[PDB]
């Protein structure tokens, strides 16, 4: 095994465990110290204002198993510190018959058992588990634990009658899944249900959704309500909140609803951020965010979606969330988005970016798998004075339209997402910032034009505003992680409305994924404008490429170029002419970003281990 | 619920949990503080000379589940003290994927991991488990833990390759069971295998048997040898040590070998006790003790057996233990005998006495189930100068015969069992002892003759020597726990060779078992004697009746009389006449015995709990 990145890569499968630990590794984002990670979990803002983030974790392995909560904290979403206890950076792990198969995703009751922060999580035990298997009741249950030391440790309730697990009965038969409890307070839902509380007797101030579905009949998000305020054992099933059809799709802008939901959450937003009104704020919109399974041919059969919903009260004292419009939270290799409230009327969302090594060819050589996305403020994006001639505007696919009284303009409403400002400020302030001159892309434009200042490593951010003619057929964008032989091309093609990431040349290492990523982006044309603009922000962080368009569209993906000099970046142009010109302005390079884990050394591998021959006997975990 | 024991019992099923805690409870023997117990485990003499005893334990329940090691210690086998740690009196419990279904029976390596006492135990996980089910590999494995604090706590080896579990591969397919590892040193087996160690490479000084069998083809005791001295991970399967047939019986004196072995151990004894020679002691005999399943119509389908064996070395470097003769360790409601070495060349054996409430009618009202037997010294019983006219002597069923050179006398050899002298001394010394006058049972003998001194409670011992004519048809014995309306009759009938416990009147409470217990007892007639003698010792301890005959035959059973005055005792006589007389001598009553748990209050119940609806979902434990 040669690690010479000035020549072509050899057979890297001969390399030892964790020999490629630093080669492709993100430095500026949330990631476990080593080993396997997946979904964020247990997210909450602590009493001191800091952020506690948990994650599905399997240390010293590069496949899922014995799944536990790893945890860390930060005062600014950006610079983090690991917890360190008797189980290293783990704070919850399988330990009881009810959760021995895995401590799955869970969410936080901030004032829970004895007033302490409390996690409601999916406790798993033995048996077939999965949307495509024949799961039985008991395999997935929901259990409580609380912390008396701000997340350094958690104490589970005892096993038994009237204790853990607290939710175990399936609300309907033949479930495809029954997990990922999302606990939330909702003045909105309380106001809606207030006239029906005699029917159910459920009067608590916390609601919980559980994600699942029904075999052959589509996904379900099940709604429970805490039976009595201040008491956390009894949760009353109200009814299904969201019901979708077997592999139903709302269309090209909305992914596919699959067969089973996962990691679903419920929030309420207005243009500024989180909305905690009872329905009285006419600018507020109710949203559900959710993953779906088996409605996608690639990306691990997983769509991370969202929907705006209008709540209706059923006669039995339950809530139907009727989907008004439906979109995609991220179009790339990410999933398992969790959102949580943050002081100052914010709802912040974060997901998991998986690797692009689905055949597990170099995972051992990495010595880790997975990272988080960046943390994102959610809000209602409102675009005023939209031209009615915007192509496809009245499809109202992942947005709503409201006509002006005179019919000459439209107000567009959709889900907004933007990187939390703490991270943008820290990134910029710690980087070498190059403010670049604007560039007209015309007949003289090369296919690729390097920026006048270049990155120094694989940790940088780009921004640019691309102004297109209303009838353009030109394409433009950014090339990143680029040398002569390796590069990743991010294109927008306004004629097709497609944002693509072409990865056919991303790496000389052929075992990594190279499929083209694709997002739809609607450029809402403004009344009186003779052009349409794409604001593109790109974060390059080891192997992560995370793209944001117009504080709306997100696409996370992976690139693993071998060569040390595959770090360059610049502008892409295709079919730009004297007549079809793309004006690029607001161009800026931030080189370096932030060291997100300042206390960690460069190599935090502790080696990898094998569970031995019993892993196959038990059949629960791959074993490595 | 009335607890008036001066009148007939009401409907005791209306009584609350643990309301009958003290009513029938042993006071003079090893028993858990409360709840469910079964098999002894983890028995060893500690460095300070005290005895550590573990037991299969499920606190706050009255059926088996979450099975754990409860533990206590004693300097004299007789007066005990509970361990008290973070899990009460438990010291090992289910905690890992490999043992989450139960910490089953295990045995002690005295100089194990890092020189510390080390337990090798059956770690169980999910799946069908049982001799009559379709068990699969992995469900029962064998794991290690060690103690740095003389049994107050145990540290398990880690889960994984080269660590726990240490034995997981089934030595043959389609096993009925794979559990109860018995670790032992054996100069005998080492000497026998010394010429074959090149074949197997196994040269360690510890052996281990694992108890099981093969579906449709009888029981098996599998022999392993520690691969390398001072190393405890690698154990090499040599071959089957004991192989018996599907429900094979050696006859009337030997129970039935069933379909599966449990709790089997290997020892070597001579007339004084334990023998640690290499084969050079011609007075020493190799023994296996073992439980069998499904070869019995009652007594929970369980026979606690033993066999004298002659070892043969196989060509592949393994040992066949060929059964020479075969007997019964206890004929009553006991099982799961474990033996362990004790200083002064002793091997001490102890088992578990189950209740006689198999339909679980009053178990909750008890608030506990189970006790130990008394601790028993094992030795080779040798009877010299036996008359060749002893009926049935040359059947050599559970004994051996060696003729004198002249053929006029026989030496009989069998397994001897006697209560450890520490217990007999402590019992007698703490009791009110009444030495009773000898009694001739003749034509004037009543059916029942109370002793001249009477017990004061349900805690006493009796002894007597019953001298019978060689052609007697009379029966004699002891009645115990007796009032006019309730009593338990212990009869010996030399003509049939049957020792019986008749329990048709043991209790007014009709839900307890009332079947007649039966043991065979061979009165070896001595050359020149005109009579034959039965030495009977009986311990009455709450509901336990534990009978010893001639330091050979043991029979443990249960009686639960309701009335407070059902405590009396005396002599039984049937068919005694002027010509057929039974001479009873050496009669002694010990009233009171010892308070075996001096630190415990009278009621150590902590209440009972229910596991809730998930118990049935998981299907592993009854849940109460
Ligand atoms: C199979 O068997 C298994 C083993 O038995 C069994 O698992 C065990 O289950 C039991 C029962 O559920 C669990 O017991 C609970 O423990 C909770 C605390 O748990 C934390 O702490 C313990 C013990 O802590 C120590 O010991 C360890 C080990 O040495 C040390 O590491 C610690 O430093 C600490 O040591 C100190 O203390 C020791 C003595 O205990 C000393 O020896 C030592 O020197 C030190 O000084 C840990 O072991 C736990 O770890 C395990 O669990 C965590 C997850 O939780 C894992 O991550 C980890 O790996 C371990 O597996 C853990 O850290 C107790 O809080 C709980 O006690 C209460 O609940 C019951 C009701 O169920 C009440 O009876 C009791 O009164 C307590 O409730 C009161 O208090 C709470 C708040 O504290 C209130 O909310 C509540 O309302 C109530 O209040 C009442 O009283 C108040 C009085 O002030 C009053 O104010 C109120 O008004 C009110 O009236 C319970 O004891 C046990 O932890 C499990 N153990 C393990 C190893 O799993 C398993 O379930 C079985 N399975 C099946 C299928 O049956
Ligand atoms: C799913 O995830 C699960 C959770 O991660 C996982 O279970 C965990 O597995 C790991 C890995 O196997 C276990 O880790 C081992 O722990 C052993 C010790 O275990 C005992 O102690 C721990 C920790 O003790 C403390 O913390 C608790 C909780 O707060 C307190 O109660 C205690 O008081 C004590 O607290 C003090 O210390 C804390 C810091 O640790 C402080 O925070 C605190 O303030 C106090 O000061 C307990 O948690 C354990 O309890 C659990 O397990 C018991 C059964 O064992 C249960 O009954 C109980 O309910 C709990 O479940 C337990 O009591 C370590 O000994 C072991 O360390 C060694 O092994 C590895 C190799 O595997 C080596 O890397 C390492 O060096 C150690 O080996 C050396 O040392 C030994 C002798 O000590 C030698 O034999 C050996 O050769 C080697 O020697 C070498 O170094 C020497 C240096 O001196 C040198 O001399 C030699 O020459 C040689 O070179 C290991 O860390 C962990 O316990 C499990 N935890 C739990 C909760 O289960 C599970 O497996 C996963 N499942 C799957 C399917 O993957
Ligand atoms: C005495 O000790 C027992 C432990 O043995 C303590 O707990 C009780 O255990 C028994 C089992 O021995 C349980 O009986 C079973 O009950 C279920 C149905 O339970 C439901 O109905 C109950 C009656 O109103 C109710 O109390 C239960 O509520 C508890 O449990 C729920 C979880 O479901 C929890 O949320 C609550 O907070 C309570 O803790 C519950 O709603 C029944 O299905 C079982 O039936 C089987 O067995 C019977 C008898 O063999 C048979 O007739 C059936 O056909 C079936 O096979 C079984 O009856 C009892 O529920 C437990 N009670 C509890 C936990 O409160 C008991 O508390 C101790 N008493 C005291 C005073 O300490
Ligand atoms: C690097 O990290 C790995 C963890 O990922 C460390 O452990 C090794 O993990 C791999 C899995 O990633 C294991 O590979 C499997 O091995 C088994 C067969 O194992 C046997 O043969 C080995 C080779 O001689 C031997 O080392 C093993 O000994 C260990 O385990 C036994 C318990 O069985 C234990 O008693 C010993 O003490 C050792 O700990 C063992 O005898 C094989 O069956 C598996 O095959 C599957 O997968 C492959 C590849 O996909 C495929 O070809 C097959 O068809 C099948 O699907 C698999 O290869 C490896 O055994 C682990 N090695 C160990 C534990 O030593 C590894 O140690 C780390 N290296 C370093 C230097 O730290
Ligand atoms: O069939 C068993 C299954 O086990 C493992 O997968 C478990 C579960 O993981 C994922 O679910 C989410 C979201 O991705 O991740 C956590 C668990 O870490 C859940 O709380 C959450 O819903 C998958 O999306 C599920 O499909 C999957 O069942 C293992 O990884 C699988 O390979 C498989 O063996
Ligand atoms: O089928 C599962 C089975 O689980 C429980 O029984 C387990 C096991 O217990 C007994 O085995 C012994 C000896 O009696 O006891 C310990 C376990 O505590 C073992 O180490 C030891 O061999 C029985 O003899 C076995 O037949 C039995 O499989 C439960 O009690 C059963 O009812 C049943 O549900
Ligand atoms: C980048 O590195 C490769 C291999 O060392 C080399 O061929 C190339 O010329 C280098 N410089 C570039 C692309 O600017
Ligand atoms: C790469 O090495 C592996 C062994 O790790 C080998 O099986 C494979 O054929 C090699 N690939 C080549 C030489 O292209
Ligand atoms: C309430 O009604 C809805 C609509 O039919 C149903 O799906 C849900 O299960 C009902 N809630 C119950 C039975 O608690
Ligand atoms: C919205 O405006 C467009 C263009 O003016 C028009 O076609 C459509 O009918 C309007 N919708 C409503 C509800 O007035
Ligand atoms: C650099 O990053 C840290 C960590 O997030 C942040 O607190 C600090 O303000 C940044 N430095 C600047 C903006 O100069
Ligand atoms: C030019 O773009 C406008 C929308 O901006 C569209 O309505 C019109 O049809 C386009 N012209 C073509 C296709 O010739
Ligand atoms: C744009 O994307 C859609 C997928 O939504 C695809 O069907 C279409 O072919 C794409 N067109 C171009 C020109 O990229
Ligand atoms: C024993 O008690 C019962 C019920 O109180 C009574 O009938 C009997 O006469 C008492 N005395 C005996 C049997 O000596
Ligand atoms: C005893 O009480 C139980 C209830 O615990 C009842 O079902 C049974 O019929 C009663 N037996 C009688 C009255 O003989
Ligand atoms: C040794 O031979 C015996 C007798 O055939 C056999 O039962 C046992 O499995 C053999 N040992 C092995 C294969 O290790
Ligand atoms: C043992 O003694 C009996 C009676 O003397 C006799 O019948 C039998 O043949 C003897 N056995 C041997 C081996 O001599
Ligand atoms: C009473 O019993 C204790 C506990 O076993 C024992 O140590 C003591 O010697 C006994 N008293 C005697 C023999 O007087
Ligand atoms: C009397 O007993 C002896 C053995 O002690 C026996 O050999 C003999 O047959 C018996 N007498 C009978 C049955 O008449
Ligand atoms: C003695 O016990 C045996 C069982 O071994 C039995 O078959 C026989 O009938 C019994 N005889 C008498 C008289 O009790």
TrEMBL record, chains A, B:
Tagged with keyword Signal: yes
Domain Glycosyl hydrolase family 32 C-terminal: 453-590
Transmembrane segments: none
GO molecular function: sucrose alpha-glucosidase activity
Binding-site list for beta-D-fructose: 38, 64, 105, 179-180, 262
Disulfide bonds: 1-15
GO annotation, cellular component aspect: cytoplasm
Classification via Pfam families: Glyco_hydro_32C, Glyco_hydro_32N
Name of protein: Beta-fructofuranosidase
Organism field: Phaffia rhodozyma (Yeast)
